Design a protein around this ligand. Structure first.
Ligand SMILES: Cc1ncc(C[n+]2csc(CCOP(=O)(O)OP(=O)(O)O)c2C)c(N)n1
Ligand SMILES: Cc1ncc(C[n+]2csc(CCOP(=O)(O)OP(=O)(O)O)c2C)c(N)n1
Ligand SMILES: [Mg+2]
Ligand SMILES: [Mg+2]
Lengths: 802, 802
């Protein structure tokens, strides 16, 4: 347990602390300007000239001084209260404020020993910001203190809230851009306070950085009336406080006193809410939130070239773009840097004076050092139940292809027991789909956590104010919550109807990018758990729905994250429940990954034993020898290959029929897609020799793909025998229809697959059989049209093992 | 002008109208149940048995009766007021309520003559819903009255608002699911009332379908306190009204009277707001919104098998799943269908009685017939300015590769003049990026429309309460607004930083799917204008930003929409401003497309004349003969190929150097990407013969790709000479850095390209030159590290034409 959580001060903030906070604000303002403008001479020692100014001025001043003000006050708070604290920088383009924070708290020099606490260190600190060979413009994962970069705006609040889940001692002041608040994901973010519990979760404090402006526009929230703004936050279940500063001549020390006193009122209320929640954990409190209304660019020159800058969108990027080039602009920069009076903040050796930091928290309470902001230092392996107890045993008992098992129900029972063994560190998220995707065996040991109105046990099944499943009809919220949950060292999984995974494609992009930078160059940031996503209710079996719900293409997005042997992405196609089991265990042991686990939820055949799934998963693709009828690759007329539960069922029925015709083939199943890539693009892929062995050197390959055929084609482009692959995939065809018709209109049904294989073997010899199969598909459809359900030859076919 | 907009009644709703509305509600409820459950015997004529019930029960009852209630009342409204009305069905899974509406209003039989107004027609109407060979489960584009399917929830409000833009006579009651309101995009949707003007735009009426439940959960909004709920909507600038019905024994006619009176109060206030806005168009009114709180599944059996159904999430999907199979369940269905007393609603011939519809609007005011809900019937071609006036003339005057032109500024001037010539039907949307992407020449003729607080001319440039540019920091809002703007027959464009286009990938998915169904099978739905998206501030030149802003992969998403010769997607890589011009004109004339127009905003060389861009765009790819030094394909040692402004600059510098070494090559530029596909996948692509001519039959091809190399590889997989293409693309490498370093770390810089070409020609002969180039890249980087800007050999290189 870190510090002394939820303690009130019961005295005023000291005058020493106010003094220190103004010194912090002035030094972090100064060094943020230095990071942006200065290539050398950080203390402006004589001669200080244009030659000290960066050739390329890049970065973001506007948000930065308001961030630095808040961080002064949050730091002061942490230290007075000994409060376990992680902040979120929504305006992540304010990167100098987060690097300045770490540098002041001492963690920057601890993590980066070359960036020393003295003039030479400070020169390097200024130069290196947004610079070739240096550091990023944003609150990147290489910044001690960051679990959120804030490059792609809108995830401030889901991360803040996922971080405090099952973290009752943790306090998260979440700085949100007022421009950011215009995004979709941020707007639904506010509603998370109905989904956390004030006894078992920690506390988020939304701080709205209402600086009036985004890039080139005012913001919506800053320009509505104050009464609308207050009604807004009250209507979302918060107690709003508003702070206004910086628009008149109020002196800075007065501003600090007033803000500290306000911030103490807000914290006191948080402490009262925490204390009350130990007794009453059912009443949802009105959590405080802070509206912080200060000028953009605060403390910068009011006008530059006769244009309003402080208190404007003009302050957004880099004021004085000509500081290197004119001398008019350099004089303004010099005066600006001087107004912070650095001669009072730095010792002659260029170290930051002791009296600038005496007020700062220390040790692991420092914002840069809290282990919650590097959660893999506190992550523990899950206590996993043995997989074998979950196996579908039907394959051993009756044969390959047996039964009508709904595959995710095995993952559900497994997840149930993981929750039981790890009761406060493994969460399930679902956009109102947990049950729909068949993971509700989990409710046998816990509830959907819901901290909002209850009506009746006749309607309110499987929910309680505390629990380890969270649902909200928002994919951004599910993915945001989980990411931060993982980033602070815990574990879990979510699920989503496959076509709607795309809502959060850009979230997968950013978390994959966080993972990339991390495995490449941040060894101090320890491994976190993986994002585990069950992609179910797939393209082929969206029976109550239709075309809008048919889009397996998150595959294609994920493929754009597969470089440089990072290995931060995996795409798995579970063939049935036993494959699902094998994949899930690997996923739950893995770290530093996004894992997409595709499985169908419909009743379906089970193809492999558990032991077989384990061996196959390990290699990535496997021959199914019990299904091949050819002896060796020379005897093979076609390779029958599959990835996907329905492509597989269809390929298998086709193989049954090709067998009965005396065609000689082999069956290859593919589970781990990226392992089809060449070793040169992927050092963990099948070797060429392994690839050739599976797929032959010179025989045609019929490949039935779950998603767009383009994926497999681009992936195998430098593989031997690639020109022989015929890839059949989803091709934007379907509607509200029978299971047979869905595969039919994509040429994915068994008859079409058979026909395709014939065409590849000898189109002339089998012209007639092909026609006959093409017509049988037409007859099977008409039969569905006329009767309301699929032709029994189709529905009732079970694989000949049995 | 349609009907008599914004007229008050000044009398009570008639008793005849209340009577009709209850008949509408009862008949649409009845027929919605019929669509879901009945394969035959729609009037339950003796014998009515289980054999009449669908074998596969699929569909969504829960939302449906509340929709049917609202539609009764909106229909009654339209007719009393002669009000130009389009509705939005947010809960688009309530498809039977929209098909029932069209069937009652008469448009279904007009558009689908086989679905007749009599027993035989009604049998077909019931059977065909969610059925093989029939119609979709959702409010699909084949439903007269639909401009929004509501399959992927969350876009109800952006569409509602984009529809009323520059549409002052149009009224849009927007039905939003209370589950839908939990999504990100819906939550920011509410804020659009700060972005429309009540004089020059029409009026949206948000109706929150607060039925208490989503799929398997209660909803956030239904379970907070009523006071929070009211504060919420008031805080977003609405006047909230609340209607509660259905939870007691209040008789239905009383419910209709009470609701009609409320709905009249709401409309009166809308009429007052409209009338006031003719004089005061600066004061933002508090638009009405309606909280409609009724039981899910309303009028269904209260309990089924001892489980609460009406007033529960259980009502969500298909109550009585066993209606075919038990007889216990069939008796319940029969009683349920009977409670609507259809013997009072249908004539003996099975036509709907006249007194059920006498209250209904007629002609083009009918919900199914309004041309706003099929906007291509009112769409007109834009009055386009001549392109030649915008040409960058530098290419003709000084040579290929001249100048430092910021390409989109030509599109900006063009857009400026399009707005001038079409002042109320062409809009620009930008997520706070219009200026950042260089389209602000548009503000020369109009303003960013902003209907919210103003502070000062010192900060509030280029904005006014009415205008034809709209910005909000939300990609969902930009894309939603535009889609509906196009769907109701107008035109426009938006722009977005490239990596953030992904926020709305799933929106592109749905609108592409709308387009697909439309071109394939809905000839009555006329062509609308295309979605035009400028994809700028690209991967290669995100100078103030870094890794989070580097992701050109919307390419890959778009490629998953390129089937069956729909031609609903285009991906264009503008090489410079003249190519941009040529592409933009084609885009602005096109229909029924999503067009992604990639262009760099950085200062950059201009490569082609306008006339050349026109010829090249038409073919899709072109040899640049003035750049080739080889005579014919036999003389060619490598094909130098490009798609992208920066890949192109880099390839050109490489070609300059390969020339000087006496290497013989050709230069192919690629603008229209999908035209690289085979004719078999794309009937408008380059012929194999055209392809071979550009790319040779047997020579290596160096392909410098703007985005992920996987895209080109999968696209050319069946093209002749494909195994000779070496595709270099973005590979997840970069940071906050120099322009040279960004291309360097992706092996995309000129030296790397040269080296690559050498390797393809003779790796052994040029081992030394390759090493030398690899080292020069290392030296150029160190130079950037040491000096703060790129090596002059790199920066100052201008193409030898000049
Ligand atoms: C999803 C997304 N869209 C667009 C951008 C482009 N962008 C970078 S900062 C910014 C404006 C930020 O304004 P605000 O959140 O108010 O922050 P401020 O700098 O005023 O603190 C925008 C539009 C982005 N970062 N993320
Ligand atoms: C973006 C998205 N995510 C998930 C779904 C899955 N889904 C289909 S309907 C539904 C619940 C809808 O509830 P609500 O909006 O309250 O509508 P109701 O049927 O009660 O009118 C969900 C979660 C979806 N359609 N869209
Ligand atoms: Mg702001
Ligand atoms: Mg609902």
């Amino acid at each position: 347990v870190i510090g002394t959580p939820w303690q009130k001060l019961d005295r005023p903030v000291s005058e020493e602390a106010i003094e220190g906070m103004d010194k912090y604000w002035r030094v972090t303002n100064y060094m943020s300007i230095g990071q942006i403008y200065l290539r050398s001479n950080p203390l402006m020692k004589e001669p200080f000239t244009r030659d000290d100014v960066k050739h390329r001025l890049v970065g973001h001043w506007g948000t930065t001084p308001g961030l630095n003000f808040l961080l002064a006050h949050i730091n002061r708070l942490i230290a007075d209260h000994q409060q376990n604290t992680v902040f979120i920088m929504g305006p992540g383009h304010g990167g100098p404020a987060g690097t300045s924070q770490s540098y002041v708290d001492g963690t920057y020099t601890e993590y980066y020993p070359n960036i020393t606490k003295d003039e030479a260190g400070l020169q390097k600190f200024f130069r290196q910001f947004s610079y070739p060979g240096g550091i990023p413009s944003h609150f990147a994962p290489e910044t001690p203190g960051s679990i959120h970069e804030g490059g792609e705006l809108g995830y401030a609040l889901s991360h803040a809230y996922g971080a405090v889940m099952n973290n009752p001692s943790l306090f998260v002041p979440c700085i949100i851009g007022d421009g950011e608040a215009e995004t979709g994901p941020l707007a639904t973010g506010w509603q998370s306070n109905k989904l956390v519990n004030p006894r078992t979760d920690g506390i988020v404090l939304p701080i709205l950085h209402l600086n009036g402006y985004k890039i080139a526009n005012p913001t919506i929230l800053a320009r509505i009336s104050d009464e609308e703004l207050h009604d807004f936050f009250r209507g979302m279940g918060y107690h709003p406080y508003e702070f206004v500063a910086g628009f008149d001549n109020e002196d800075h020390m007065s501003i600090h006193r007033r803000f500290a006193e306000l911030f103490e009122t807000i914290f006191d209320e948080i402490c009262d809410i925490k204390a009350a929640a130990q007794t009453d954990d059912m009443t949802r409190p009105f959590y405080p939130m802070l509206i912080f209304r200060t000028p953009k660019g605060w403390t910068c020159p009011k006008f530059i070239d006769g244009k309003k800058t402080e208190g404007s969108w003009r302050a957004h990027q880099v004021p004085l773009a000509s500081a290197r080039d004119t001398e008019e602009h350099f004089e303004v920069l010099k005066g600006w840097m001087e107004s912070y009076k650095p001669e009072e903040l730095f010792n002659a050796d260029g170290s930051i004076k002791d009296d600038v930091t005496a007020f700062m928290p220390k040790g692991e309470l420092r914002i840069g050092a809290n282990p919650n902001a590097n959660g893999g230092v506190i992550r523990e392996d899950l206590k996993l139940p043995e997989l074998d107890q979950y196996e579908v045993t039907g394959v051993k008992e009756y044969g390959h292809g047996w039964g009508q098992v709904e595959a995710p129900r095995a993952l559900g029972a497994y997840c149930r027991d993981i929750i039981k063994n790890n009761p406060d560190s493994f969460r399930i998220f679902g956009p109102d789909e947990t049950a729909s995707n068949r993971l509700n065996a989990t409710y046998e040991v816990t509830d959907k956590q819901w901290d909002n109105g209850y009506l009746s046990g006749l309607v309110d099944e499987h929910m309680a104010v505390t629990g380890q499943v969270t649902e909200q009809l928002s994919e951004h919220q599910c993915e945001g919550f989980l990411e931060a949950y993982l980033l602070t060292g815990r574990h879990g999984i979510w699920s989503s109807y496959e076509s709607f995974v795309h809502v959060i494609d850009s979230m997968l992009n950013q978390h994959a990018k966080w993972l990339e930078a991390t495995v490449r160059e941040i060894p101090w940031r320890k491994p976190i758990s993986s994002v585990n996503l069950l992609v179910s209710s797939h393209v082929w079996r969206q029976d109550h729905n239709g075309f809008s719900h048919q889009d397996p293409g998150v595959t294609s997005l994920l493929i754009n994250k597969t470089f440089n042997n990072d290995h931060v992405t995996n795409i798995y196609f579970a063939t049935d429940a036993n494959m699902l089991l094998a994949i899930s265990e690997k996923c739950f042991k893995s770290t530093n990954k996004i894992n997409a686990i595709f499985a169908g939820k419909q009743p379906a055949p089970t193809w492999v034993t558990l032991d077989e799934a384990r061996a196959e998963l390990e290699a990535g693709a496997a021959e199914w020898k019990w299904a091949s009828n050819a002896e060796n690759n020379d005897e093979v007329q076609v390779v029958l290959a599959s990835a996907g539960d329905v492509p597989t069922q269809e390929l298998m029925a086709a193989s049954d029929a090709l067998n009965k015709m005396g065609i000689k083939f082999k069956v290859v199943n593919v589970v781990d897609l990226l392992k089809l890539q060449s070793r040169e693009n992927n050092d963990e892929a099948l070797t060429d020799e392994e690839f050739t062995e599976l797929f032959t050197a010179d025989k045609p390959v019929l490949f039935a793909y779950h998603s767009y055929a383009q994926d497999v084609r681009g992936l195998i482009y430098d593989r031997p025998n690639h020109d022989n692959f015929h890839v059949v995939g989803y091709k934007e065809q379907g509607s509200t229809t029978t299971p047979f018709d869905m595969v039919r209109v994509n040429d994915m049904d068994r008859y079409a697959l058979q026909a395709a294989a014939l065409k590849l073997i000898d189109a002339d010899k089998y012209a007639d059989k092909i026609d006959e199969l093409n017509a049988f598909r037409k007859k099977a459809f008409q039969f569905a049209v006329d009767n309301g359900y699929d032709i029994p030859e189709f529905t009732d076919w079970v694989y000949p093992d049995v």
